[PDB]
Amino acid sequence: ESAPITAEDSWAVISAFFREKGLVSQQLDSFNQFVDYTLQDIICEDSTLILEQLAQHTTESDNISRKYEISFGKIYVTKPMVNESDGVTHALYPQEARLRNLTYSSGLFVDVKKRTYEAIDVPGRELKYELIAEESEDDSESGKVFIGRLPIMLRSKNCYLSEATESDLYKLKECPFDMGGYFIINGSEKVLIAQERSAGNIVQVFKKAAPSPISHVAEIRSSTLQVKLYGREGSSARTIKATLPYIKQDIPIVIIFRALGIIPDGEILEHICYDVNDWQMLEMLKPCVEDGFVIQDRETALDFIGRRGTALGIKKEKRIQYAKDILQKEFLPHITQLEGFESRKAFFLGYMINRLLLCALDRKDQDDRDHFGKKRLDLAGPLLAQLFKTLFKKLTKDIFRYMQRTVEEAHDFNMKLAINAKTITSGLKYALATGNWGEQKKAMSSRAGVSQVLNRYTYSSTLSHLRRTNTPIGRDGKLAKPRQLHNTHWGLVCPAETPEGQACGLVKNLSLMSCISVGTDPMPIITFLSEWGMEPLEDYVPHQSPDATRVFVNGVWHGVHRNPARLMETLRTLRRKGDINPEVSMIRDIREKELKIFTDAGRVYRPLFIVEDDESLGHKELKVRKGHIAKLMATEYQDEYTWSSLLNEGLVEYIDAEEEESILIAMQPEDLEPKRIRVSHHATTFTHCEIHPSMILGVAASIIPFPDHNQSPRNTYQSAMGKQAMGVFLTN
Amino acid sequence: MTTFRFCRDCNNMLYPREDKENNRLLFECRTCSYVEEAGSPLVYRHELITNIGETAGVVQDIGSDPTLPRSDRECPKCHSRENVFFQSQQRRKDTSMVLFFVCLSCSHIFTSDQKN
Amino acid sequence: TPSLTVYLEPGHAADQEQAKLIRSAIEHTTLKSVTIASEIYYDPDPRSTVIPEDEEIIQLHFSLLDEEAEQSFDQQSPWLLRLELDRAAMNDKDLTMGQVGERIKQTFKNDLFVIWSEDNDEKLIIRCRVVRPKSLDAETEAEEDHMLKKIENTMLENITLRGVENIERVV
Amino acid sequence: PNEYNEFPLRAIPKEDLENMRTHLLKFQSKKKINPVTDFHLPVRLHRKEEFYPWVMEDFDGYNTWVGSYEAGNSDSYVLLSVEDDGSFTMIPADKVYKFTARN
Amino acid sequence: SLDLDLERSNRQVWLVRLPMFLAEKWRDRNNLHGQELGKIRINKDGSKITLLLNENDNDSIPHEYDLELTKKVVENEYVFTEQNPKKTAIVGTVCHECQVMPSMNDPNYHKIVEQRRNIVKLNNK
């Protein structure tokens, strides 16, 4: 029962995987995340609306200043239903929406509370408002203000189809072979194809050809910061300059450090360079010190900043305050926004310029822009959140404008009249139907093709359509590198199946087991990380400990550490034992002494096995055994013991395209022990195994027989032509 | 090899200056009154081409990287036959393919090129 | 990728040596390419140094300088272009140390004088000391480094020992 | 090796903390600065709520320190005041200020 | 309100870092009345330090934690107090830096880490 594993067990585990997740799980999970959590936060961002009407001083009775406060509360979502022209209300089902050209959607209810404050406007004195009237109907059903209608994706949590059995689907006349994952808009089925994006909060070092004085560039997007190094290699003149937002001329780096709060010159180099012995680092920083030594004053730099604003002739002190506020408000917002976090910003700027200068000293290379680990996929959820935020902002602006208008006439406003509930509904319906992802007024410049009409020609065509990703680069753009297949696509993208013509390589189809992460909070991770022996970045001195690992969380440096091996072992223990959900990625780079933790959304991951060293057998072996496979067979035939049972026991692990840079995988299980030509790989420190190589293929190419005896373009051609065969697209 | 020298008062780097009546070099801080006596006529250095031998880079805890290969060559110091080996980690274009071996036990660095 | 193919004379076509002489006579050679260490050093008193290697070269020219050079001893900059020159690069272009190092360089603007050794020394060390009038202003004379770093850069970049412009390589 | 010493853990009541507001006073220097010699008593400390930075000037004006508030110190520090009985009393930390010397 | 009280500032003061939950639990006002709430134990070699909470406290909190040394020598840190221009008084100079971690021997660690799991699951973004 302690025996090794054979490929039959691999197919057993895959059978469990598809019996648990499904082929369209990504859309459903993104929609559930959006509806349950993000929708509440989008309104809670802008709950309070304020009107401050000062006294017109026309008469004594007009000397009272007024304040109006509007606040929002919970969100309630009903099951989809329709009200006919007669005013009768009945629950809407997909059949009626399809036949009658309706729109599958539901209604949204939000709590609203109002407050009125009145103060006596005494000139020369601060206004002291007092609570007088507060309208809050939380104790009655009239408090739920109807705000709009939201489309519903099939088979999601709210839809009636979620809990339907086979006889339920037949009496309602469903195809049991239908999976959901699409909207019904205007009586036609629509689907949202995943949209590819380049990640943010990651410093990237580039390079330039030299007809121009530019030599290197360091980029970060949080708001953008460019710290450029000018001066050719080997010359005496070295310049390092940063380009801040709303500052045009630009100013050097030592001036930035002086303005930021680090006055002494010796501390600058402790911020930049973390190794005392290296002399080339300081040699390249010498001209910066020489030029920045002339001015020991923040205020000259702040005067530099003040002149370049649109307003001209401002007094010096106001310019000082303005330039002071620019740093904490718009300079690297992804670290912090509130006041007093200057040490973190100074160290992060030092780290960025350190990495730029390291690349400038040929110790490393340019960042690869094609690496699939630096790309995120936007599903229905994020796109809906974007559009909902925009429309809600416009709607609340309109409410404020109308309420001001009715205050001008001294008329009480009905909250059920100030709201134009048609704005949200019309905007969402127009965006989903036309596909132009933007406002109706500015739809010309918005993204297109985001929403497409589902293809039902054959069943495999529906399957292939619900699993498609688009790379929003100009399809006539002559950039060859995004088109070509890249080393990081192993197991996450189908190599065979791609369109032909102008969309070659730009349209991608996932493999059978490449899921996507939903999103999770980073705060508990940071709290635990500081709990288990992490020194904060405030109390970090380079010279006391020059061999300290740096610690990152989603691209913001929080400090250092001294013994990282046990931290990684404990972190992976907790990730494997369910204390943290396995969608979080945790990489360690030994060569540069770095730790990176990612908890964001949009990362493609695939399952893999786990290799551990068994001393009783004297060598390594998988954690999985014949007992687990027997339990899987028992549960499958009984259709308990499921895929999550394997996951929580530390038998499988989800690996993205970034952690893969620091692992070793044995492809066949028998390759882990000490026709065709199969070579015995020299490795002996294996960490994971491939569940099965066949899964590196999509859904289209999983029907060719013996695909490896074929030239690859032939596999591509059949993956194309498999969507034009005639057959039973649905059993109903 | 010129070394930066910081003033003992405000940590600022010391600028050179000359003393004509005694004809001697001094280092002064432009912000305070500190002056210190130069010990050598070597203040600045500007090399052009680097004749640096290729370096293995960071070595600390390199034996726990599981993507690094192995070899059965014998240690020249502790006579152990297990070690890690890798190519030069400096990314110059023209670097040769000369290996570097780090011993497992004594953490001793050596190369496969035994030139006398 | 522009290019240019040159065919040699009928007599020199079959022999490699005249071909290499022509190749040296065509390629563009500049000072920055021929210095393994064109190091900007402090040269407060060029009369004597601490480094033993340049000390041998010192007495060579100090017994080999004319009366005008003896008068101009004070014109030599308080900083030095100390040229450790690579033997291989110098011999590759058939570049004699003295004639090419000094004739054209001093003829161009009478800007930089040199104490230079014969090629037989194990370390080819040149001392490039710029020449300026003593009539320089007091504020000017104080800012030695300010003039000399700039003129040293303009010296490395803008002096052509031999060759024709814009031709990066000849093969 | 199991010999240990005994330090009881005491505290300071609310009546003393009400009129005693604590503030972490941090000086930036590369040298061990002590007020016994480097400060000529008395010292003048004022603010010229966190908008005005702290200013600590000596009687002769030679030693002037300007202190700014550093925020985001997520470590809630504690003060361990030693009493006459050798016990340690806890004092919660309210604010932290960093001082630098005037040029 | 100008002079500094250095008459009793000669004694060295420990610098200890407490965990967030433990520190917040120790900010309780009712327990500030000079009550003896815990004790420390120092090894003969001084490498291992154990903090044991007194039994007078509720059994809902772990009664054992361990301490680790960050810097063997700690310099240029002073502890002050300010009371009612405000009158300031230095308390002393800092001697050692130590950090608190939960003890594995006390099972209550798991419980609070269980609560940590309870913290992890509820909040979402």
mmCIF file of N, CA and C in Angstrom, chain A residues 557-621:
data_model
loop_
_atom_site.group_PDB
_atom_site.id
_atom_site.type_symbol
_atom_site.label_atom_id
_atom_site.label_comp_id
_atom_site.label_asym_id
_atom_site.label_seq_id
_atom_site.Cartn_x
_atom_site.Cartn_y
_atom_site.Cartn_z
ATOM 1 N N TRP A 557 8.241 46.914 -0.676
ATOM 2 C CA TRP A 557 9.227 46.438 0.282
ATOM 3 C C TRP A 557 8.807 46.802 1.700
ATOM 4 N N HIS A 558 8.733 45.799 2.572
ATOM 5 C CA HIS A 558 8.355 46.011 3.962
ATOM 6 C C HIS A 558 9.500 45.836 4.947
ATOM 7 N N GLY A 559 10.649 45.351 4.513
ATOM 8 C CA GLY A 559 11.782 45.229 5.400
ATOM 9 C C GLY A 559 12.680 44.077 4.991
ATOM 10 N N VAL A 560 13.447 43.600 5.968
ATOM 11 C CA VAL A 560 14.506 42.638 5.748
ATOM 12 C C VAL A 560 14.338 41.476 6.718
ATOM 13 N N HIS A 561 15.279 40.540 6.640
ATOM 14 C CA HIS A 561 15.269 39.333 7.448
ATOM 15 C C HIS A 561 16.670 38.738 7.416
ATOM 16 N N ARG A 562 16.929 37.820 8.341
ATOM 17 C CA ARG A 562 18.273 37.298 8.540
ATOM 18 C C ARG A 562 18.411 35.801 8.305
ATOM 19 N N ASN A 563 17.400 34.997 8.632
ATOM 20 C CA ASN A 563 17.443 33.552 8.408
ATOM 21 C C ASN A 563 16.210 33.151 7.607
ATOM 22 N N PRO A 564 16.293 33.176 6.272
ATOM 23 C CA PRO A 564 15.087 32.966 5.456
ATOM 24 C C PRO A 564 14.712 31.511 5.222
ATOM 25 N N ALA A 565 15.647 30.569 5.370
ATOM 26 C CA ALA A 565 15.359 29.181 5.025
ATOM 27 C C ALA A 565 14.228 28.617 5.877
ATOM 28 N N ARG A 566 14.292 28.840 7.189
ATOM 29 C CA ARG A 566 13.241 28.333 8.062
ATOM 30 C C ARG A 566 11.923 29.057 7.824
ATOM 31 N N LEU A 567 11.975 30.338 7.459
ATOM 32 C CA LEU A 567 10.744 31.041 7.111
ATOM 33 C C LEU A 567 10.080 30.430 5.887
ATOM 34 N N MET A 568 10.858 30.123 4.847
ATOM 35 C CA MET A 568 10.270 29.481 3.676
ATOM 36 C C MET A 568 9.718 28.104 4.011
ATOM 37 N N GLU A 569 10.443 27.324 4.816
ATOM 38 C CA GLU A 569 9.938 26.001 5.170
ATOM 39 C C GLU A 569 8.634 26.102 5.962
ATOM 40 N N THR A 570 8.549 27.056 6.897
ATOM 41 C CA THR A 570 7.328 27.221 7.681
ATOM 42 C C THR A 570 6.183 27.750 6.827
ATOM 43 N N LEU A 571 6.470 28.714 5.947
ATOM 44 C CA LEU A 571 5.440 29.252 5.070
ATOM 45 C C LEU A 571 4.860 28.169 4.177
ATOM 46 N N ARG A 572 5.717 27.340 3.579
ATOM 47 C CA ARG A 572 5.202 26.273 2.734
ATOM 48 C C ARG A 572 4.496 25.204 3.553
ATOM 49 N N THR A 573 4.924 24.980 4.799
ATOM 50 C CA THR A 573 4.173 24.091 5.677
ATOM 51 C C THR A 573 2.754 24.602 5.886
ATOM 52 N N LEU A 574 2.607 25.901 6.151
ATOM 53 C CA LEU A 574 1.282 26.465 6.383
ATOM 54 C C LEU A 574 0.448 26.479 5.106
ATOM 55 N N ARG A 575 1.077 26.748 3.962
ATOM 56 C CA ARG A 575 0.347 26.719 2.697
ATOM 57 C C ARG A 575 -0.132 25.308 2.369
ATOM 58 N N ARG A 576 0.684 24.297 2.672
ATOM 59 C CA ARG A 576 0.300 22.914 2.426
ATOM 60 C C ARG A 576 -0.684 22.379 3.453
ATOM 61 N N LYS A 577 -0.772 22.988 4.635
ATOM 62 C CA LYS A 577 -1.683 22.518 5.671
ATOM 63 C C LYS A 577 -2.968 23.337 5.743
ATOM 64 N N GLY A 578 -3.210 24.213 4.771
ATOM 65 C CA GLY A 578 -4.471 24.914 4.677
ATOM 66 C C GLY A 578 -4.596 26.184 5.489
ATOM 67 N N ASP A 579 -3.534 26.615 6.174
ATOM 68 C CA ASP A 579 -3.605 27.883 6.897
ATOM 69 C C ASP A 579 -3.695 29.062 5.938
ATOM 70 N N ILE A 580 -3.182 28.906 4.721
ATOM 71 C CA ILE A 580 -3.314 29.895 3.661
ATOM 72 C C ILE A 580 -3.840 29.182 2.425
ATOM 73 N N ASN A 581 -4.676 29.865 1.654
ATOM 74 C CA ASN A 581 -5.221 29.246 0.456
ATOM 75 C C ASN A 581 -4.128 29.095 -0.600
ATOM 76 N N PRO A 582 -4.129 27.998 -1.357
ATOM 77 C CA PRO A 582 -3.007 27.703 -2.257
ATOM 78 C C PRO A 582 -2.978 28.523 -3.537
ATOM 79 N N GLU A 583 -3.777 29.579 -3.654
ATOM 80 C CA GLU A 583 -3.668 30.465 -4.807
ATOM 81 C C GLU A 583 -2.582 31.520 -4.633
ATOM 82 N N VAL A 584 -1.954 31.586 -3.458
ATOM 83 C CA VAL A 584 -0.909 32.557 -3.145
ATOM 84 C C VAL A 584 0.430 32.004 -3.599
ATOM 85 N N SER A 585 1.278 32.859 -4.164
ATOM 86 C CA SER A 585 2.568 32.408 -4.672
ATOM 87 C C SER A 585 3.688 32.973 -3.812
ATOM 88 N N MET A 586 4.719 32.156 -3.580
ATOM 89 C CA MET A 586 5.789 32.479 -2.636
ATOM 90 C C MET A 586 7.102 31.989 -3.235
ATOM 91 N N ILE A 587 7.878 32.896 -3.819
ATOM 92 C CA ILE A 587 9.147 32.534 -4.436
ATOM 93 C C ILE A 587 10.295 33.080 -3.593
ATOM 94 N N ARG A 588 11.410 32.353 -3.600
ATOM 95 C CA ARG A 588 12.653 32.811 -2.996
ATOM 96 C C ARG A 588 13.762 32.751 -4.036
ATOM 97 N N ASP A 589 14.507 33.842 -4.167
ATOM 98 C CA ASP A 589 15.658 33.916 -5.061
ATOM 99 C C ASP A 589 16.915 33.914 -4.199
ATOM 100 N N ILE A 590 17.666 32.814 -4.256
ATOM 101 C CA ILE A 590 18.854 32.669 -3.421
ATOM 102 C C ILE A 590 19.971 33.588 -3.899
ATOM 103 N N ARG A 591 20.142 33.711 -5.215
ATOM 104 C CA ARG A 591 21.284 34.446 -5.749
ATOM 105 C C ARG A 591 21.244 35.919 -5.352
ATOM 106 N N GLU A 592 20.066 36.536 -5.387
ATOM 107 C CA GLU A 592 19.919 37.935 -5.009
ATOM 108 C C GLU A 592 19.380 38.119 -3.597
ATOM 109 N N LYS A 593 19.172 37.034 -2.851
ATOM 110 C CA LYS A 593 18.701 37.091 -1.466
ATOM 111 C C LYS A 593 17.372 37.838 -1.370
ATOM 112 N N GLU A 594 16.348 37.276 -2.012
ATOM 113 C CA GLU A 594 15.054 37.937 -2.112
ATOM 114 C C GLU A 594 13.915 36.974 -1.810
ATOM 115 N N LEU A 595 12.831 37.537 -1.282
ATOM 116 C CA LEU A 595 11.577 36.832 -1.070
ATOM 117 C C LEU A 595 10.473 37.629 -1.740
ATOM 118 N N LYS A 596 9.641 36.957 -2.531
ATOM 119 C CA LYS A 596 8.512 37.614 -3.172
ATOM 120 C C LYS A 596 7.239 36.842 -2.872
ATOM 121 N N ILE A 597 6.185 37.577 -2.531
ATOM 122 C CA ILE A 597 4.884 37.016 -2.202
ATOM 123 C C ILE A 597 3.846 37.717 -3.064
ATOM 124 N N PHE A 598 3.014 36.939 -3.745
ATOM 125 C CA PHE A 598 1.959 37.475 -4.594
ATOM 126 C C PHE A 598 0.617 36.930 -4.139
ATOM 127 N N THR A 599 -0.331 37.847 -3.919
ATOM 128 C CA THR A 599 -1.698 37.516 -3.540
ATOM 129 C C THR A 599 -2.728 38.202 -4.431
ATOM 130 N N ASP A 600 -2.307 38.792 -5.547
ATOM 131 C CA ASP A 600 -3.209 39.550 -6.401
ATOM 132 C C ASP A 600 -4.054 38.592 -7.240
ATOM 133 N N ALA A 601 -4.828 39.144 -8.168
ATOM 134 C CA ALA A 601 -5.719 38.370 -9.018
ATOM 135 C C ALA A 601 -5.263 38.441 -10.467
ATOM 136 N N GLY A 602 -5.470 37.349 -11.186
ATOM 137 C CA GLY A 602 -5.115 37.259 -12.580
ATOM 138 C C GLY A 602 -3.939 36.361 -12.916
ATOM 139 N N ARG A 603 -3.593 35.410 -12.056
ATOM 140 C CA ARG A 603 -2.426 34.561 -12.258
ATOM 141 C C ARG A 603 -2.866 33.158 -12.646
ATOM 142 N N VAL A 604 -2.256 32.625 -13.701
ATOM 143 C CA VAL A 604 -2.570 31.295 -14.202
ATOM 144 C C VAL A 604 -1.711 30.267 -13.479
ATOM 145 N N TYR A 605 -2.356 29.248 -12.919
ATOM 146 C CA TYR A 605 -1.663 28.211 -12.174
ATOM 147 C C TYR A 605 -2.166 26.843 -12.609
ATOM 148 N N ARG A 606 -1.319 25.836 -12.440
ATOM 149 C CA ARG A 606 -1.668 24.465 -12.774
ATOM 150 C C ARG A 606 -1.288 23.529 -11.636
ATOM 151 N N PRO A 607 -1.987 22.405 -11.506
ATOM 152 C CA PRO A 607 -1.643 21.438 -10.457
ATOM 153 C C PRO A 607 -0.377 20.659 -10.777
ATOM 154 N N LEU A 608 0.289 20.202 -9.715
ATOM 155 C CA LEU A 608 1.478 19.369 -9.818
ATOM 156 C C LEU A 608 1.547 18.474 -8.593
ATOM 157 N N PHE A 609 2.405 17.457 -8.671
ATOM 158 C CA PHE A 609 2.588 16.515 -7.578
ATOM 159 C C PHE A 609 3.679 17.016 -6.631
ATOM 160 N N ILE A 610 3.904 16.280 -5.546
ATOM 161 C CA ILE A 610 4.868 16.666 -4.522
ATOM 162 C C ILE A 610 5.841 15.516 -4.304
ATOM 163 N N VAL A 611 7.137 15.815 -4.349
ATOM 164 C CA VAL A 611 8.199 14.839 -4.124
ATOM 165 C C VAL A 611 8.836 15.125 -2.774
ATOM 166 N N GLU A 612 8.913 14.101 -1.925
ATOM 167 C CA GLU A 612 9.542 14.208 -0.620
ATOM 168 C C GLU A 612 10.507 13.049 -0.435
ATOM 169 N N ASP A 613 11.557 13.288 0.346
ATOM 170 C CA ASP A 613 12.588 12.282 0.562
ATOM 171 C C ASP A 613 12.138 11.298 1.635
ATOM 172 N N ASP A 614 11.897 10.053 1.235
ATOM 173 C CA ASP A 614 11.574 8.974 2.156
ATOM 174 C C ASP A 614 12.872 8.287 2.565
ATOM 175 N N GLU A 615 13.166 8.323 3.867
ATOM 176 C CA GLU A 615 14.377 7.689 4.377
ATOM 177 C C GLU A 615 14.229 6.175 4.463
ATOM 178 N N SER A 616 13.016 5.680 4.716
ATOM 179 C CA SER A 616 12.812 4.238 4.801
ATOM 180 C C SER A 616 13.124 3.560 3.475
ATOM 181 N N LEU A 617 12.705 4.165 2.363
ATOM 182 C CA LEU A 617 13.123 3.692 1.050
ATOM 183 C C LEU A 617 14.486 4.231 0.639
ATOM 184 N N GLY A 618 15.041 5.172 1.398
ATOM 185 C CA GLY A 618 16.377 5.665 1.145
ATOM 186 C C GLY A 618 16.514 6.645 0.005
ATOM 187 N N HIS A 619 15.409 7.135 -0.548
ATOM 188 C CA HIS A 619 15.472 8.055 -1.681
ATOM 189 C C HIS A 619 14.156 8.816 -1.740
ATOM 190 N N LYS A 620 13.967 9.583 -2.805
ATOM 191 C CA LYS A 620 12.770 10.402 -2.875
ATOM 192 C C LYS A 620 11.607 9.612 -3.464
ATOM 193 N N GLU A 621 10.393 10.098 -3.197
ATOM 194 C CA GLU A 621 9.175 9.493 -3.720
ATOM 195 C C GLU A 621 8.030 10.479 -3.515
#
